[PDB]
């Protein structure tokens, strides 16, 4: 009947759910300071921004003329590679991303 | 002897606070799934589970039966620790986190 999608594949991760979960609940009531502030580490700190770079450079960095993202010989380091993506993690990603930045 | 420099309104905390909140934007729904995955690092893939394992230790209280220690061998550490932050007041969980575990 239809598409309906076909089926996924999963395995080990029943905390990476659930509980990933109740962390969008703190935030929105933006009572997330004190939780997030609870983990925070020096190692993350460097991280938070080295985090919302990658975003905004993926879309709003193929415009910049200081070549960040470029011609750096190790700005395209891991900031996008990271770990492990292929061709299906970041077609994933669009779908969000144009509703936030774009918004239309 | 900046013949044009300027600042606009100096500081910067506008940020963290301005890229966390895109960061709700795409829970919201179910939108933070991809994002979620730029968050697969390793080094993060472990302070996950642990994010989770210290909170819900902290409340313990609600008679926590298999939920004392998963990690016996070595992690009970993480947990038992203590204050980590130099204002030691951690009260300001206290007013989400009650709500989270027990929720009225």
Chains 1, 2 share one sequence.
Do not use: C
């Not at 770079?53 to 750096?72: H, P, T």
């Amino acid at each position: 009947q239809s598409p309906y999608s076909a089926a996924m594949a999963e395995q080990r991760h029943q905390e990476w759910l659930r509980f990933v979960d109740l962390l969008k609940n703190a935030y929105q009531n933006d009572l997330h300071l004190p939780l997030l502030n609870l983990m925070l580490t020096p190692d993350e700190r460097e991280a938070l921004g080295t985090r919302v770079r990658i975003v905004e450079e993926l879309l709003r960095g193929e415009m910049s003329q200081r070549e960040l993202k470029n011609e750096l010989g190790a700005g395209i380091a891991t900031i996008t590679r990271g770990s492990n993506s292929l061709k299906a993690a970041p077609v994933e990603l669009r779908q969000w991303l144009e509703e936030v930045l774009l918004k239309s």
